Amino acid sequence: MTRDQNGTWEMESNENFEGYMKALDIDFATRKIAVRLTQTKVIDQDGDNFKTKTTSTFRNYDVDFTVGVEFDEYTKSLDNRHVKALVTWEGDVLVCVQKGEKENRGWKQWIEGDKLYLELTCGDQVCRQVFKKKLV
Numbered sequence: 001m002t003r004d005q006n007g008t009w010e011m012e013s014n015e016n017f018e019g020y021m022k023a024l025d026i027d028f029a030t031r032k033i034a035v036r037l038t039q040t041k042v043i044d045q046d047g048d049n050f051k052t053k054t055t056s057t058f059r060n061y062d063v064d065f066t067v068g069v070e071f072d073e074y075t076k077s078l079d080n081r082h083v084k085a086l087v088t089w090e091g092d093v094l095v096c097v098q099k100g101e102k103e104n105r106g107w108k109q110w111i112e113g114d115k116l117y118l119e120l121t122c123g124d125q126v127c128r129q130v131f132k133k134k135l136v
């Protein structure tokens, strides 16, 4: 029973964020800033209802969803694309498929210990992020 992802989580590693961004066609001036930033993830979860915020000094991104309920996602101030998104549980891993113009786009997010793991995929690029839970 590790489905409870509530908390504030601070990034400690970010592997291949460059390649993921390039796969999304982010221009190199934007990538040059974005690759350097420490991200924070704030998750407010009530059962299968999620409200999430990913924040940095450069850009913030909010996405809210209910597990199992397809929704329209506009990735505003990221790559600015429209996708149909569905989040499901695979065991205690939260799995998102983002169907749209990019093939094999989505993410997977799960807890181990005091860490939150997030693997972002686009095409043949995978970015692996790890966040540490912030205290009180």
Ligand SMILES: CCCCCCCC/C=C\CCCCCCCC(=O)OC(CO)CO
Pocket: 021, 024, 026, 030, 031, 034, 039, 041, 052, 054, 055, 056, 058, 059, 060, 061, 063, 077, 078, 079, 107, 109, 118, 120
């Ligand atoms: C926002 C902080 C970084 C902003 C700088 C990046 C700008 C360059 C363009 C694209 C990179 C998109 C990468 C972030 C993916 C969104 C996070 C996300 O959807 O996470 C899920 C799972 O946590 C939310 O529930």
